[PDB]
Coordinates of C-alpha atoms in Angstrom, one line a residue:
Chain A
X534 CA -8.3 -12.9 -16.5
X535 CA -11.3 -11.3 -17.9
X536 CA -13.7 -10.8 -15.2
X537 CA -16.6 -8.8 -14.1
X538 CA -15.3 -6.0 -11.7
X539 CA -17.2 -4.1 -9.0
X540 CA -15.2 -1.6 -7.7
X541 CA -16.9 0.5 -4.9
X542 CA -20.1 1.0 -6.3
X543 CA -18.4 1.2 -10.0
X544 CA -18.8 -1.6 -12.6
X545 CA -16.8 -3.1 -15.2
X546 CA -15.2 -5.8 -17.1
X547 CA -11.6 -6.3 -17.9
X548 CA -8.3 -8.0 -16.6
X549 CA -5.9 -6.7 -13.9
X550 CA -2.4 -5.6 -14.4
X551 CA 0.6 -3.8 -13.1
X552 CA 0.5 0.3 -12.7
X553 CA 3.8 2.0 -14.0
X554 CA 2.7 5.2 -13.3
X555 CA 2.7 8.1 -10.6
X556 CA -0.2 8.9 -8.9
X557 CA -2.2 10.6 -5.8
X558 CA -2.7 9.1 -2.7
X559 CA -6.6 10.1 -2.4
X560 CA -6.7 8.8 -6.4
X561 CA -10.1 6.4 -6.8
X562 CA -9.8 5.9 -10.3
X563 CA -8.6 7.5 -13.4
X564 CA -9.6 7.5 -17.1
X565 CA -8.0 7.3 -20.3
X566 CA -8.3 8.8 -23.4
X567 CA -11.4 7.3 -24.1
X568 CA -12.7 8.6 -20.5
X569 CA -13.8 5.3 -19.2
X570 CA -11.7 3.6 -16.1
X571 CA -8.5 2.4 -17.2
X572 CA -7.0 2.4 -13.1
X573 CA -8.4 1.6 -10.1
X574 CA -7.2 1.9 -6.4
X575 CA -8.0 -1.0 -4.2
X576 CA -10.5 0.2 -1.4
X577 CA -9.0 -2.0 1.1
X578 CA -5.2 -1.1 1.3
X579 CA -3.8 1.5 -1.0
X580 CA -3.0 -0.6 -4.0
X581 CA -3.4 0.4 -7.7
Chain B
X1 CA -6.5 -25.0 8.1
X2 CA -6.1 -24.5 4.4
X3 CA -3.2 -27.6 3.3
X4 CA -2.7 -29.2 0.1
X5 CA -2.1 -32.7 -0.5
X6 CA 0.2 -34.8 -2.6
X7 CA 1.8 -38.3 -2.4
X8 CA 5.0 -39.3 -1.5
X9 CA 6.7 -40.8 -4.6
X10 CA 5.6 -41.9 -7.6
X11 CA 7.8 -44.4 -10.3
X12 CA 7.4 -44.0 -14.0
X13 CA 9.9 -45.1 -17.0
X14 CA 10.4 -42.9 -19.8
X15 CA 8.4 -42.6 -22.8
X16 CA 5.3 -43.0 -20.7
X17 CA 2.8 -40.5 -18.9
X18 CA 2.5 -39.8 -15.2
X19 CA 0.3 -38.2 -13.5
X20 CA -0.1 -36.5 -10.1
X21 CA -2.7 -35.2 -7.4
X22 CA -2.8 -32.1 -5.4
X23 CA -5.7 -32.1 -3.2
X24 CA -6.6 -29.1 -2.0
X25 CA -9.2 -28.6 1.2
X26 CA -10.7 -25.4 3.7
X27 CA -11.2 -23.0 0.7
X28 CA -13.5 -23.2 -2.9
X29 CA -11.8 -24.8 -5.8
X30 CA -12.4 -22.3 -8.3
X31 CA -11.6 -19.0 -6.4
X32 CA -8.0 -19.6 -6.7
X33 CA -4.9 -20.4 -9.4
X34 CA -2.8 -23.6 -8.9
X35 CA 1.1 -23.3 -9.8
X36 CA 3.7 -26.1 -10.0
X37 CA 7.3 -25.9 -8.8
X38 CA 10.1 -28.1 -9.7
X39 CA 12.6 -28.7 -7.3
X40 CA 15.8 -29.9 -9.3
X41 CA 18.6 -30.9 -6.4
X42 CA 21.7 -28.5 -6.7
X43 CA 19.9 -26.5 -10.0
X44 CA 17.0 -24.9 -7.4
X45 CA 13.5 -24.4 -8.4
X46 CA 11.9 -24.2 -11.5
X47 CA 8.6 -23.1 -12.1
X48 CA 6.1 -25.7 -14.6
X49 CA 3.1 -23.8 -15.2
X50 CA 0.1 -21.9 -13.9
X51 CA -4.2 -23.0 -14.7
X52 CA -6.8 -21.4 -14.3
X53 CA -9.1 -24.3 -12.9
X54 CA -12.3 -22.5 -13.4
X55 CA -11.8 -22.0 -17.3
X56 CA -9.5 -24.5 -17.1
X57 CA -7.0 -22.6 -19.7
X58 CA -3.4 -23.0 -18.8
X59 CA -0.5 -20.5 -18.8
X60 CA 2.9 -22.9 -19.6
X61 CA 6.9 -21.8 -20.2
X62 CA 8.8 -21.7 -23.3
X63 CA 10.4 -24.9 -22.3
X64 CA 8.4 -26.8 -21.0
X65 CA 5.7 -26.6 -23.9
X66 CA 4.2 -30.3 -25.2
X67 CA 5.6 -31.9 -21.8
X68 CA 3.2 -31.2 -19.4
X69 CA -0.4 -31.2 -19.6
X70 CA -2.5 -29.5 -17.0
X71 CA -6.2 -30.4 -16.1
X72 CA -8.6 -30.2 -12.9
X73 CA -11.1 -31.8 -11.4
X74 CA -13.7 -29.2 -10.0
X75 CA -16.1 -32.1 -8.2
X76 CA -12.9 -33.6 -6.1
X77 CA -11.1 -29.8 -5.7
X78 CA -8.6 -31.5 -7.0
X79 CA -6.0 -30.2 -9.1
X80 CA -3.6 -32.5 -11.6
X81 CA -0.7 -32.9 -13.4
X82 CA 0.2 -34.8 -16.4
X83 CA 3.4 -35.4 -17.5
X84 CA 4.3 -36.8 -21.4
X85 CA 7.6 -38.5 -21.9
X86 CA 10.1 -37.4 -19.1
X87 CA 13.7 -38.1 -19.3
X88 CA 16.7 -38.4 -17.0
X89 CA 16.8 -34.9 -16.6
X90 CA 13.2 -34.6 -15.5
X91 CA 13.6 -36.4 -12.3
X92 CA 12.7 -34.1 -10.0
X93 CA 10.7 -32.6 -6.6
X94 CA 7.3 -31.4 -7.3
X95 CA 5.3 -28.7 -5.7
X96 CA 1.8 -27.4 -5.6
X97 CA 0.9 -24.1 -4.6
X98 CA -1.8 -21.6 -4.1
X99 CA -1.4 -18.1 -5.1
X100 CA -3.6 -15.7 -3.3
X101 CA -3.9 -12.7 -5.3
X102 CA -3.7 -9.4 -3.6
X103 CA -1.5 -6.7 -5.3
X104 CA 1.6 -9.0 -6.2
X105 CA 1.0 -12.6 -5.7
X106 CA 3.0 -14.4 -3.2
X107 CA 3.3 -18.1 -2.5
X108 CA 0.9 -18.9 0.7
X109 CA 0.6 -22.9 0.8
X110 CA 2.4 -25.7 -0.5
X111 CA 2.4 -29.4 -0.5
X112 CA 4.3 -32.7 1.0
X113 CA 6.6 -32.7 -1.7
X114 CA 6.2 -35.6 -4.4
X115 CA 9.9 -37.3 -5.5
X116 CA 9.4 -38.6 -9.4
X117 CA 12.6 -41.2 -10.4
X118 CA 12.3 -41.6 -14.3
X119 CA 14.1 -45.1 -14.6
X120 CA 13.1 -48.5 -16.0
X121 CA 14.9 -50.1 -13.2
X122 CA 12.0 -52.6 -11.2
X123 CA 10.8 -52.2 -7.9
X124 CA 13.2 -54.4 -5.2
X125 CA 12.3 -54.8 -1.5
X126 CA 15.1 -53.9 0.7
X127 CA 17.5 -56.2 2.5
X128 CA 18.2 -55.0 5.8
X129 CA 21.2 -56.5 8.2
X130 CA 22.6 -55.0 11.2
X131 CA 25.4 -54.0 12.3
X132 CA 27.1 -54.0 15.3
X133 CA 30.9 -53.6 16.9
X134 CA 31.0 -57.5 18.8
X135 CA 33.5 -56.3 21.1
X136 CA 34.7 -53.5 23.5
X137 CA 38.3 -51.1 24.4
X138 CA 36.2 -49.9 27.4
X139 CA 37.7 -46.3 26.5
X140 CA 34.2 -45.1 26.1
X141 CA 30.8 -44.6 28.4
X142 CA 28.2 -45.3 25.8
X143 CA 27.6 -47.5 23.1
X144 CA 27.2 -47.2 19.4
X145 CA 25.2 -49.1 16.8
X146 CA 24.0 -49.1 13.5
X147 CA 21.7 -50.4 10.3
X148 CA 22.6 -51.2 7.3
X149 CA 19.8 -50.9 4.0
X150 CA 21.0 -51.9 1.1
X151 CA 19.1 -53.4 -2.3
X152 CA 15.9 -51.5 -2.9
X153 CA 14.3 -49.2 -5.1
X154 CA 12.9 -46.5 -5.5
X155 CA 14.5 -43.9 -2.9
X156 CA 13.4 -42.3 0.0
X157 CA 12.9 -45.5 2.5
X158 CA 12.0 -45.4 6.2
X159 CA 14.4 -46.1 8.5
X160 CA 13.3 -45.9 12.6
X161 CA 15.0 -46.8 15.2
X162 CA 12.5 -49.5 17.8
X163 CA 9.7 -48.3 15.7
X164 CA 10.3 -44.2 16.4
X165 CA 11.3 -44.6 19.9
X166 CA 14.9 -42.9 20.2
X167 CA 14.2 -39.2 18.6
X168 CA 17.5 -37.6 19.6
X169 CA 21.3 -39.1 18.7
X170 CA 20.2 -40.0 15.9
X171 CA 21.8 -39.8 11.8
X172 CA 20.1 -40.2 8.6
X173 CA 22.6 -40.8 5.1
X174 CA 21.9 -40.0 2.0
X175 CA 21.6 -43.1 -0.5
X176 CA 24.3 -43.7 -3.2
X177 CA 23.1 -45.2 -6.4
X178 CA 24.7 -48.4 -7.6
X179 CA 24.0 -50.4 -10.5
X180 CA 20.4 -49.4 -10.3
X181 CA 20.7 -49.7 -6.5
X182 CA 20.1 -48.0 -3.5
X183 CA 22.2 -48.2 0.0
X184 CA 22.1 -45.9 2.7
X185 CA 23.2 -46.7 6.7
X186 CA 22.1 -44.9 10.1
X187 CA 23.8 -44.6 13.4
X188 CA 23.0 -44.5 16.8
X189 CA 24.5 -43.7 20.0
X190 CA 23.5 -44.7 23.4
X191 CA 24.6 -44.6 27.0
X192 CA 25.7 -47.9 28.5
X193 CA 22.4 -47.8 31.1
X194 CA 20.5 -48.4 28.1
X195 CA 22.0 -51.4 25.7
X196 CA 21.5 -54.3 28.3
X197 CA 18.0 -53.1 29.2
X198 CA 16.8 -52.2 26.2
X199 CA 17.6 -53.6 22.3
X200 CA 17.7 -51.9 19.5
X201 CA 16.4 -53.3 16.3
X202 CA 16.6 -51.7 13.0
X203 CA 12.7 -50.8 11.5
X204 CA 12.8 -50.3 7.8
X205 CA 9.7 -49.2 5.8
X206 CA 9.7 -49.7 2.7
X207 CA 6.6 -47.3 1.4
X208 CA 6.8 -48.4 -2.5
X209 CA 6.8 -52.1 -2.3
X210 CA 4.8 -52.2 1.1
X211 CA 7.4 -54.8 3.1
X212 CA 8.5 -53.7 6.6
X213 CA 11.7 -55.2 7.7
X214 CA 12.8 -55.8 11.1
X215 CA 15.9 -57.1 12.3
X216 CA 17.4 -57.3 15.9
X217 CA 21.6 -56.1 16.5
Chain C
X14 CA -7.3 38.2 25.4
X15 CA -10.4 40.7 25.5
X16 CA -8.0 43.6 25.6
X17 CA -6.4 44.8 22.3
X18 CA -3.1 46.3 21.6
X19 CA -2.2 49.7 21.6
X20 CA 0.5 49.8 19.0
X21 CA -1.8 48.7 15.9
X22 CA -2.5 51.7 13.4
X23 CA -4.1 51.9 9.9
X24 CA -2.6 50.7 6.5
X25 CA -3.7 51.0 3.0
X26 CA -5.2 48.5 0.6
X27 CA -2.7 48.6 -1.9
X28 CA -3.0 46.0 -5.1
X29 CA -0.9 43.3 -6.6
X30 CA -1.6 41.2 -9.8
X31 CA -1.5 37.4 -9.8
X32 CA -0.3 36.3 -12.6
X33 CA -1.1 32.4 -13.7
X34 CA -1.9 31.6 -10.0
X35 CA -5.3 30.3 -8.5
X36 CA -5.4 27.1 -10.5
X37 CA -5.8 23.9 -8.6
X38 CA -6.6 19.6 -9.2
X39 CA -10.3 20.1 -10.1
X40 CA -10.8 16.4 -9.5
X41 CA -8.8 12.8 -8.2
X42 CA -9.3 11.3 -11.7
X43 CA -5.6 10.8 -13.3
X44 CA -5.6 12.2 -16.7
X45 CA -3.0 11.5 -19.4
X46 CA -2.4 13.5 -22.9
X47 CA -5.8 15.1 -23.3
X48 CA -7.1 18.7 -23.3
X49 CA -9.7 18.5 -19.9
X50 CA -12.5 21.6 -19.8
X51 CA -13.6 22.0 -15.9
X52 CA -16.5 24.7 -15.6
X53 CA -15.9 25.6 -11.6
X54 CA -15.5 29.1 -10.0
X55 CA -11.9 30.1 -10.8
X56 CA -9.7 33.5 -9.8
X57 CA -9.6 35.5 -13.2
X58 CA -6.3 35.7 -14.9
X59 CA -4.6 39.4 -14.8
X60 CA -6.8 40.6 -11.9
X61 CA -5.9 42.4 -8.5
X62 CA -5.4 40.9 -4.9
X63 CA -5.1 43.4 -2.2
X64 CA -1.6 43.9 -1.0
X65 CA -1.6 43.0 3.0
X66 CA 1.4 43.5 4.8
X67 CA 2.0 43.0 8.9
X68 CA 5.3 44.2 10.4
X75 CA 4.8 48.7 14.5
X76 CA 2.4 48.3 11.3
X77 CA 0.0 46.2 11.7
X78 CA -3.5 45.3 9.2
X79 CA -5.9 42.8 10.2
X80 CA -9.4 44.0 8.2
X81 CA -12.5 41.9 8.1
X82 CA -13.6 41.0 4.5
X83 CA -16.6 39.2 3.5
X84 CA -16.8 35.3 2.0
X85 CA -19.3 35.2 -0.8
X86 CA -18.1 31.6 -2.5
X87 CA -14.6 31.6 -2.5
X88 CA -11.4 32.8 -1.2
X89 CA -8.0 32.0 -2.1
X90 CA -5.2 32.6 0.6
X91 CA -0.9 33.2 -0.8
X92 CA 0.3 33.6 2.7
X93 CA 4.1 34.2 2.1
X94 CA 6.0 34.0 5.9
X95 CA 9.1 33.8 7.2
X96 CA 8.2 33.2 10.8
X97 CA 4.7 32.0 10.2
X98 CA 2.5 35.0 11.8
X99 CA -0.8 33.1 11.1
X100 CA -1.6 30.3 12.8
X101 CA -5.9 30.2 12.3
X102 CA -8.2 31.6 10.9
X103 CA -11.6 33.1 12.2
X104 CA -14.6 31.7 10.0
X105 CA -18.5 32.6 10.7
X106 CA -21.9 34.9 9.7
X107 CA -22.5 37.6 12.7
X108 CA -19.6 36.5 15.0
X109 CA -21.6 35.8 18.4
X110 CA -23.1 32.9 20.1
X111 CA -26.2 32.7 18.2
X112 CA -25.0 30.8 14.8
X113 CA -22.7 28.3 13.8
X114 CA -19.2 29.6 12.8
X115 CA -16.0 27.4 11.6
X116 CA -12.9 27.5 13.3
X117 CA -9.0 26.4 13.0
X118 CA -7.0 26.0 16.0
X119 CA -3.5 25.1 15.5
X120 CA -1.6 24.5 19.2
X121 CA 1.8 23.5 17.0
X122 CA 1.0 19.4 17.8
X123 CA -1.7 19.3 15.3
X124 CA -4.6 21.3 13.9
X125 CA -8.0 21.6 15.6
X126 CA -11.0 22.2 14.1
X127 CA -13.9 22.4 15.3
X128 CA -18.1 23.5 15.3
X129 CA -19.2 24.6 17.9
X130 CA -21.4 28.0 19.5
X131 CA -18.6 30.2 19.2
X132 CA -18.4 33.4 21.5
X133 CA -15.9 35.9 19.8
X134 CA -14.1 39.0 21.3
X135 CA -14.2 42.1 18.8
X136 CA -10.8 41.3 18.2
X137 CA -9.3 38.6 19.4
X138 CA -5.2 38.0 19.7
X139 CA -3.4 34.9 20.0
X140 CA -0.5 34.7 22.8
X154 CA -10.0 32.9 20.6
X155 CA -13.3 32.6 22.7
X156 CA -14.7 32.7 26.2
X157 CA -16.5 29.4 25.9
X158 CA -18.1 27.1 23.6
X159 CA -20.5 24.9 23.7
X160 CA -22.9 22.4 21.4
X161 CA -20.5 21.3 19.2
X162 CA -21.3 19.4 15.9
X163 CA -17.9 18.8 14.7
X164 CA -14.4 17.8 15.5
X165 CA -11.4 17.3 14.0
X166 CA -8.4 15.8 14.8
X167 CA -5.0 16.1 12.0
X168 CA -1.4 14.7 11.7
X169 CA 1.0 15.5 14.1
X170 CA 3.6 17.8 13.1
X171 CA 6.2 20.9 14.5
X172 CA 6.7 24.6 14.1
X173 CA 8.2 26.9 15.6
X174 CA 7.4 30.4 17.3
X175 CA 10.1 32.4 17.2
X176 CA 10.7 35.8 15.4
X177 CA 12.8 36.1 12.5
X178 CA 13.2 39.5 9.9
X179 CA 14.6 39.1 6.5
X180 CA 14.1 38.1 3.2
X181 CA 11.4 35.0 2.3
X182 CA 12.4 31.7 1.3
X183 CA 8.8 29.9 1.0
X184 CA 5.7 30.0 -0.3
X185 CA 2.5 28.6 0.8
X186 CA -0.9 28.6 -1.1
X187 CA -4.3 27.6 1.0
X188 CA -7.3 27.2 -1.2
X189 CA -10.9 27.3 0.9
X190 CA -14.1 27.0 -0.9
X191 CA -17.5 26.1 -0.7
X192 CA -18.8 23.5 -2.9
X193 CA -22.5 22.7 -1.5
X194 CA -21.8 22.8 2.3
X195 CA -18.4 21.2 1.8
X196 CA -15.5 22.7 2.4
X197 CA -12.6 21.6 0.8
X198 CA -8.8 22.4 1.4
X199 CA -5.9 22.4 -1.3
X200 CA -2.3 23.4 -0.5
X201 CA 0.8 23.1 -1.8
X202 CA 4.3 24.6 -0.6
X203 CA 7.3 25.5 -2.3
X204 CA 10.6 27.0 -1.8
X205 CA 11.0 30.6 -4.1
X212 CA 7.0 40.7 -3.3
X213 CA 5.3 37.9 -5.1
X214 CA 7.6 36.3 -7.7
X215 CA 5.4 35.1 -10.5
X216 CA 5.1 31.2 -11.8
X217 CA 2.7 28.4 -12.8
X218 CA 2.0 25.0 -10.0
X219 CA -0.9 23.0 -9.0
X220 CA -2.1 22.2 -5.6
X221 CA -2.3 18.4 -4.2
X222 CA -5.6 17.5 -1.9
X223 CA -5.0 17.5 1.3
X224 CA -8.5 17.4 3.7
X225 CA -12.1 17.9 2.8
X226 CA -14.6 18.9 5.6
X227 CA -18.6 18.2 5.2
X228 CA -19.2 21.2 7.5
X229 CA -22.4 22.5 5.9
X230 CA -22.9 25.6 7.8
X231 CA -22.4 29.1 5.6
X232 CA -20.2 31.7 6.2
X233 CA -20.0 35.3 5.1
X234 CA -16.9 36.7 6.7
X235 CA -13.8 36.1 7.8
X236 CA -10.9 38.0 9.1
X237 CA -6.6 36.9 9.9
X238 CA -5.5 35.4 13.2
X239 CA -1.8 36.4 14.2
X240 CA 0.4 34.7 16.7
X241 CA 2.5 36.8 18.6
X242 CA 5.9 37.1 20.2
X243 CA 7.2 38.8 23.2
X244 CA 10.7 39.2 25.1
X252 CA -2.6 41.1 25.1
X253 CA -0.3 44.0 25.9
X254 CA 2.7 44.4 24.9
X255 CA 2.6 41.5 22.4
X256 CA 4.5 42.4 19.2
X257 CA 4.9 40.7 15.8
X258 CA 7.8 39.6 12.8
X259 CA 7.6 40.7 9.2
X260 CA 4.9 38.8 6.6
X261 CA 2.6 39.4 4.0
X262 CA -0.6 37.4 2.6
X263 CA -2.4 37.8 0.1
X264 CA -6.8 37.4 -0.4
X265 CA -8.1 36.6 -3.5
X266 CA -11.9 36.4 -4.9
X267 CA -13.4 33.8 -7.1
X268 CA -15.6 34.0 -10.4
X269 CA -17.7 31.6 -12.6
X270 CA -14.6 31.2 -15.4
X271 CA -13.5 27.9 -17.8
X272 CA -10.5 26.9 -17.8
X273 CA -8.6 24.4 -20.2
X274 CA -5.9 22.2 -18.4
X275 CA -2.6 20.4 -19.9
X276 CA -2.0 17.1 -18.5
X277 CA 1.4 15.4 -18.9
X278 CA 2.1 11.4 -18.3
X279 CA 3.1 12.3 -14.4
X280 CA -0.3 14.2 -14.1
X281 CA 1.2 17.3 -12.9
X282 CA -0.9 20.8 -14.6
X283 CA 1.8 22.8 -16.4
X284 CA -0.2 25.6 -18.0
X285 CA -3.8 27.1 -17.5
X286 CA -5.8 28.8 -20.2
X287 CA -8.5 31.1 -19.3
X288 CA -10.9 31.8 -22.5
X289 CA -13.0 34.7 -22.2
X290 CA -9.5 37.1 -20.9
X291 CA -7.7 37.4 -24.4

């Protein structure tokens, strides 16, 4: 669903979906081509 | 306690609409999705369709497009579900469900369970008439009885024996359906301290047509 | 403990190049397809590292910390187990230290008194102590072994505005040349400078008589360089440009 996100201190709006890809542990987020936040780890429990 | 609501059973013929309630209570309305699962007997569950009840926009199956029709009411926190046209096939269980979203969604609540019978057959009250042996071989210490409901419509009834009393020796059959009919019988089996003290009458409920039936053995 | 051994003598400072090595994850932030430019304080490509080497030979010199250091430690029977971080190595300042007892790795800051040289079988006492550190638990063992070396192990510790920030990565393989990166591991807001540092070995007998196996590790400095990063769908650095060498 398009929502607004906070995300730790770090805004944006978008919808959530599944992560196919391999990444760090200590990851926060990542960017895309574009270099805006395209993934986002869950601050809670480890969960991208 | 978060716990969702529905009622029992619901009767509908074909080529109408029907429409059901889930009723949901302890959490905010519009925080959460709503998901319905049918329960087909022997086929195993099937999954109707998934709203959104804030934007109320609705996320349906292939299959099952133009049959249902899902809306909420955000005042009540009450979700519904609105059939069009069911058939013979459709007849069904019906779930409600809240997903909470945290990673992959799971199933945490559900509902009582509603049991739909798409039918044009009328609504009969039940004639209830015991049964009983009339005679004993003496080859055994206790002593077994039984009920017999037969004539009524639509299926599940309640059947207690002296009103819920006797909670253990106790068997519930399933209903066979004849000529837009409905029997079923229950049996009972109690030591011989018991029968000339106490007597056992057979307690049907009949939760459609609102007629409780009681008759002595 | 105060007393030093008697069988240590002197050994040169011999040089060995590093070839594409020095080059770690810059940042967390997953990258996919692009060409990334990271300005950050880098080991120049094609440069020298001085050649250490402890086997009755042994070398343990005292080198100064200006912003960074990388460490290419390649053991067999792991000879270091801590390092010696600090400024003027008494009781006066604050100096960083890494204790490794083989459960799990201490570190800690705290008024460090040193010995001129102290051995491991570090300090008479210590006291005020701003820091600690507890790490996961883990095994290794002691014991002596000479031969050839399977491993290698590659500690990164910098500087970056008081914190100090450790990247590592080990692989299976005197220094056979490559390309890798080097995951995150622990970052520690110490905030306390340092402009020395010098090698802790663990020793082994059948501080005295104490003797040692066969390893070498390597020191390396760091410069103000750019370098321009690959990034493949996995995330994983396969090559490293450095723009003012050629």
């Amino acid at each position: 669903k398009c929502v607004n996100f906070n995300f730790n201190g770090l805004k944006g709006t978008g919808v959530l979906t599944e992560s196919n890809k391999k990444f760090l542990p200590f990851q926060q987020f990542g960017r895309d081509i574009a270099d805006t936040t395209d993934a986002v780890r869950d601050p809670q429990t480890l969960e991208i | 306690q978060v716990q969702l609501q529905q009622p029992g059973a619901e009767l509908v013929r074909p080529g109408a609409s029907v429409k059901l309630s889930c009723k949901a209570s302890g959490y905010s309305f519009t925080r959460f999705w709503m998901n319905w699962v049918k329960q087909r007997p022997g086929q195993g569950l099937e999954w109707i369709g998934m709203i959104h009840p804030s934007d109320s926009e609705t996320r349906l199956n292939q299959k099952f497009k133009d049959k249902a029709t899902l809306t909420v009411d955000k005042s009540s926190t009450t979700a519904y579900m609105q059939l069009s046209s069911p058939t013979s096939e459709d007849s069904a269980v019906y779930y409600c469900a809240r997903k909470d979203y945290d990673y992959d969604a799971w199933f945490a609540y559900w509902g009582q369970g509603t049991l739909v019978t798409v039918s044009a057959a009328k609504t009969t009250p039940p004639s209830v008439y015991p049964l009983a042996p009339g005679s004993a071989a003496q080859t055994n210490s206790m002593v077994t009885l039984g009920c017999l409901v037969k004539g009524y419509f639509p299926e599940p009834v309640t059947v207690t024996w002296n009103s819920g009393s006797l909670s253990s020796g106790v068997h519930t059959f399933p209903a066979v359906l004849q000529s837009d009919l409905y029997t079923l019988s229950s049996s009972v089996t109690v030591p011989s301290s018991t029968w000339p003290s106490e007597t056992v009458t057979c307690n049907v409920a009949h939760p459609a047509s609102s007629t409780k039936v009681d008759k002595k053995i | 403990q105060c007393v030093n051994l008697t069988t240590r003598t002197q050994l040169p400072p011999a040089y060995t190049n590093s070839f594409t090595r020095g080059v770690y994850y810059p940042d967390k932030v997953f990258r996919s397809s692009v060409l990334h430019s990271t300005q950050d304080l880098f080991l120049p490509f094609f440069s020298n590292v001085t050649w250490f080497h402890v086997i009755k030979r042994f070398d343990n010199p005292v080198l100064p910390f200006n912003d960074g250091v990388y460490f290419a430690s390649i053991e067999k029977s792991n000879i270091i187990r801590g390092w010696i971080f600090g400024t003027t190595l008494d009781s006066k300042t604050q100096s960083l230290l890494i204790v490794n007892n083989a459960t799990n790795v201490v570190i800690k800051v705290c008024e460090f008194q040193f010995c001129n040289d102290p051995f491991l079988d570090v300090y008479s006492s210590a006291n005020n102590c701003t820091f600690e550190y507890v790490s996961q638990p883990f095994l290794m063992d002691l014991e002596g072994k000479q031969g050839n070396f399977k491993n290698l192990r590659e500690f990164v510790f910098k500087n970056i505005d008081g914190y100090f920030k450790i990247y590592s990565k080990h692989t299976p393989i005197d220094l056979p040349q490559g390309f890798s990166a080097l995951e995150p591991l622990v970052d520690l807001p110490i905030g306390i400078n340092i402009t020395r540092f010098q090698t802790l070995l663990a020793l082994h007998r059948s501080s005295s008589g104490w003797t040692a196996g066969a390893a070498a590790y390597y020191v390396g400095y760091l410069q103000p360089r750019t370098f321009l990063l690959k990034y493949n769908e996995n995330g994983t650095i396969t090559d490293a440009v450095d723009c003012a060498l050629d």
